[PDB]
């Protein structure tokens, strides 16, 4: 019974839908039993969200969960909302002049019997006074039962994956154009996002961050924020590791065999909403998706298998019940269960379709060797069997190679391969900037030490293959740790870490908000940690998330919880743009 980051946000969100009940008193349960809900006897309320806040709720809660919490209706602050003078209202909206104004307008209008103002991040005195002044001249200040800064300004995608939804950060931060002001402002927001997360965790962590770039600024910014918070209170432990995306670009482009990553990669998977290919079917991977929370971290083959094991144990399970016996269905539990299966059932199917229709298992190998012509060839060799549904992956696997190379990479490829694109005409504005990032991928890979360790589908129920699962199962390489996992490893478990990883993270800015100045320095000290919050400033991936979890979920002798997150969870594709935009801008 261990709580995930998402469970903690869902709990905070739920506590708010209960008029921030149970607050100011006792109780340690987590997801209210119904017999207790009947203890306070709850009444229906209106729930007003705004664009940004809806994105936060719809990520962790389903409509059924809302009703179950007493929410009758939910609508955006900006819509024309029909009055409900005798019903309570809970606003969960962004701290903006715009919204505040509307709360004041609805307050006057008498749209609802009461108001429970809940701000997404934190309302500034600036606006508190504003809202106050306006409300003062109303004879209704009495109807506002409570105003709360909820500090839930982030989205929790998977159980331990979070995003500040601050898109295009790597660009904004490294674009020469960008002001020395725009940068400070950006950092300040990221610092807030983190802070918002940290408070949700209810743990004041030790901040550790790579020096020199953004990550440091943000670290020192968040250090100061957390420091005051500890002060303005009175007058093991956790760690928060803040890294620069510069630590490992190869991973932003790489290819993977684990279920999530593929789905995230090949089927733009956002907000628990897979999008399978103008043609576009949409499957919802609703949190607590019986299968998904069981085969996400699993390699395509096992997953594909485990699906047919479930569709098999479903056909059985349903046969025993077939003996006794938005639409009220005869058996919801069963229908719902089969339907989750029906989802993955063809995600795998549509996946294979995508695998073969562009022979993907190739790129994956071209990147598992970064070395001699053994691999060198296999690449031009692959771009020799020309297509089009490879074009993107081509550029990617190339970049991976150019970056992980561990040795020059002949002026030949750069020319021959570069040609293959400028002739097939697929702007390579990116390969301009990419070549620079190589010196980074090389310095941290050298500074670290990697440790290791449709009917057709209903078809593959053998425990073996379908003549395609065979190749992928054999092509299962060394799921060795990645650069990020190394840095986290050395920080969370010092005693059992390579000297290289320890020494490299040893150079990481160390800061404790509970102390004041520190000493002459904030002389880095090694400690072990149970939980950690890991934030990459400039880009997040399922690839790194996947790694970090496998690493954490394999720690026997002092288990670890790792919460990963970035300014935005960017897609190999999307990140590939950000880069090229810098190659475009970094010349004119």
């Amino acid at each position: 019974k261990d709580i995930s980051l998402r469970d903690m946000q869902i709990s905070a969100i739920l506590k708010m839908l209960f008029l921030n009940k149970d607050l100011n008193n006792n109780d340690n349960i987590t997801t209210i039993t119904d017999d207790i809900f009947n203890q306070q006897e709850i009444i229906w309320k209106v729930l007003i969200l705004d664009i940004k806040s809806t994105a936060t709720i719809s990520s962790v809660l389903r409509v059924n969960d809302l009703l179950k919490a007493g929410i009758t209706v939910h609508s955006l602050i900006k819509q024309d909302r029909s009055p409900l003078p005798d019903v309570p209202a809970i606003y969960f909206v962004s701290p903006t002049k715009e919204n505040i104004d509307i709360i004041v307008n609805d307050l006057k209008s008498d749209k609802y019997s009461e108001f429970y103002i809940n701000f997404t991040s934190s309302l500034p005195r600036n606006l508190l006074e504003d809202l106050a002044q306006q409300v003062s001249i109303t004879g209704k200040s009495d109807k506002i039962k409570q105003v709360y800064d909820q500090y839930l300004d982030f989205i929790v995608t998977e159980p331990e994956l979070f995003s500040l939804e601050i898109s295009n950060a790597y660009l904004t931060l490294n674009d020469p154009k960008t002001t020395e002001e725009e940068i400070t402002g950006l950092c300040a927001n990221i610092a807030d996002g983190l802070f918002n997360t940290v408070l949700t965790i209810n743990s004041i962590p030790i901040i550790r961050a790579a020096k020199g770039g953004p990550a440091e600024i943000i670290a020192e910014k968040l250090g100061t924020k957390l420091r005051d918070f500890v002060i303005n209170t009175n007058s093991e432990r956790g760690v928060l590791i803040i890294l620069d995306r510069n630590i490992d670009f190869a991973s932003m482009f790489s290819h993977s065999w684990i279920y999530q990553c593929m789905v995230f990669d090949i089927f733009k998977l956002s907000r628990n909403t897979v999008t399978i290919p103008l043609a576009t079917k949409k499957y919802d991977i609703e949190p607590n998706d019986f299968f998904w929370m069981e085969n996400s971290h699993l390699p395509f083959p096992e997953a594909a298998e485990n699906v047919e094991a479930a569709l098999n144990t479903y056909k059985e399970e349903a046969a025993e019940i077939t003996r006794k016996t938005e639409v009220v269905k005869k058996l919801p539990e069963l229908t719902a269960k089969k339907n989750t299966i029906d989802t993955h059932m063809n995600i795998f199917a549509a996946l294979l379709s995508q695998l073969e229709s562009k022979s993907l298992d190739t790129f994956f190998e071209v990147e598992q060797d970064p070395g001699s012509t053994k691999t060198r060839s296999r690449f031009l060799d692959i771009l020799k069997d020309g297509k089009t549904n490879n074009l993107e992956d081509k550029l990617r696997s190339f970049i991976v190679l150019y970056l992980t190379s561990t040795t020059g990479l002949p002026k030949d490829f750069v020319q021959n391969v570069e040609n293959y694109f400028k002739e097939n005409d697929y702007d390579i504005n990116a390969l301009k900037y990419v070549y620079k990032l190589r010196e980074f991928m090389q310095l941290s890979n050298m500074s670290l030490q990697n440790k290791s360790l449709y009917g057709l589908t209903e078809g593959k129920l053998q425990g073996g293959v379908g003549s395609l699962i065979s190749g992928i199962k054999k092509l299962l390489p060394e799921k060795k740790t990645i650069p990020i996992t190394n840095v986290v490893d050395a920080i969370m478990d010092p005693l059992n870490s390579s000297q290289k990883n320890l020494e490299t993270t040893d150079s990481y800015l160390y800061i404790d908000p509970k102390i004041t100045r520190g000493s002459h320095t904030r002389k880095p000290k090694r400690q072990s940690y149970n939980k950690s919050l890991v934030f990459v400033v400039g880009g997040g991936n399922y690839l790194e998330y996947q790694n970090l979890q496998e690493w954490a979920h394999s720690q026997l002798h002092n288990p670890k919880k790792v919460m990963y997150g970035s300014t935005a969870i960017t897609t190999p594709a999307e990140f590939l743009n950000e880069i090229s935009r810098l190659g475009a801008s970094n010349s004119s």
Partner: peptide, 26 residues
């Protein structure tokens, strides 16, 4: 932070006490 967050989160009183000062002035 440490169950001290509940403190930083609730701003009702702070608010009301402002509504109040704004009433006394206007």
């Amino acid at each position: 932070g440490a169950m001290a967050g509940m403190n930083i989160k609730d701003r009702t009183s702070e608010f009301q006490q402002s509504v109040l000062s704004y009433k006394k002035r206007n």
